Amino acid sequence: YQCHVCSAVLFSPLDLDAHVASHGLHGNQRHITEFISSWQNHPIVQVSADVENRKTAQ
Amino acid sequence: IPVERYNILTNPDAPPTQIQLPEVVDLYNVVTRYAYETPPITAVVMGVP
Amino acid sequence: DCRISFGMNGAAPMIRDETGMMVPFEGNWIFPLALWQMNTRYFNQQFDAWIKTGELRIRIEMGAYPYMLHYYDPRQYANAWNLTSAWLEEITPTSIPS
Amino acid sequence: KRIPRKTKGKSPATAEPGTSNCEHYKARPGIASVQKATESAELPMKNNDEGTPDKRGNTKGALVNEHVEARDEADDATKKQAKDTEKAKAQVTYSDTGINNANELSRSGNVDNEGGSNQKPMSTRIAEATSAIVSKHPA
Amino acid sequence: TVTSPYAPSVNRLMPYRISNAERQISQIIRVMNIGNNATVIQPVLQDIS
């Protein structure tokens, strides 16, 4: 899978539907900022500092 | 029952948004309900030659 | 300043000319190799589907480059995409293969 | 959808020819080291609150002099600097510099808001000043 | 060069714009917070270093 707006790689169709909401597309909330570079494969998300058990998120 | 507080109902020739707020507060008004979306800060960092 | 703009509601995506115009993914283009290297991944996903079956053509200008040869029998079907895709997806902001 | 609180208050799709995840490039600046440095530098500032009152009206902090308070904060900063640099003696000292700074004051909990010392806290002063003039029943 | 694409929407709410006066007042409050306490200056300079 992949989003043709920001060129990010997803895995599930529900994942794509939840991802396009950050750009403004609908379908049929934990992140604060979401970046992605164009020369490498390494997204960087940023989540609030009080939440528990963060899985590799700044 | 105080009809002064139920103004838009009792008073026929009153605009639906009229309020005499400083003197008597009304108990039946016109509320405006919203439904927004607050997306996260998105960016696509491109490189420069 | 090469910027991409996603297409919406069926309209094709567009890339920005050096002179401020935005064009679709088709025709004859001219890239600096550094311009490709700085965006090796964002460009593969957007462009490779159009070079393979579409009508896109790009002239990556390099000046000098080492090469490698692959010989094939002319009387049998042959196809270059498996070779020319493993090169494009391996171009990097620091290296290029033969 | 109920959001908790941080404190307490009053209580035929074939694979298209572009995608891959092979990780050919590695950054020279070092993404992990840059993220670590950014994490260290992103932190908000310490809250310097001593000298300000609490709910009951009593100032917060120790009962030490102002200037000695400034000196203690200075050499504690020096010790922390040495600890961060991972040495025995800090190389960038905040204390015992060449500058004569004997007039420097640093906010402490010795002085209240009026301008008097609190050797007897504000609540105690109020309580005794009010109790000095109460009266009882005759008999 | 950063780029952040999106679709046409009017019900999007991203409250982040302020005036320079509020930034200046916050700066004054922080300068007062410093208060000759070297402990609140040390980590800033060390981490920027």
Ligand SMILES: [Zn+2]
């Ligand atoms: Zn996306």
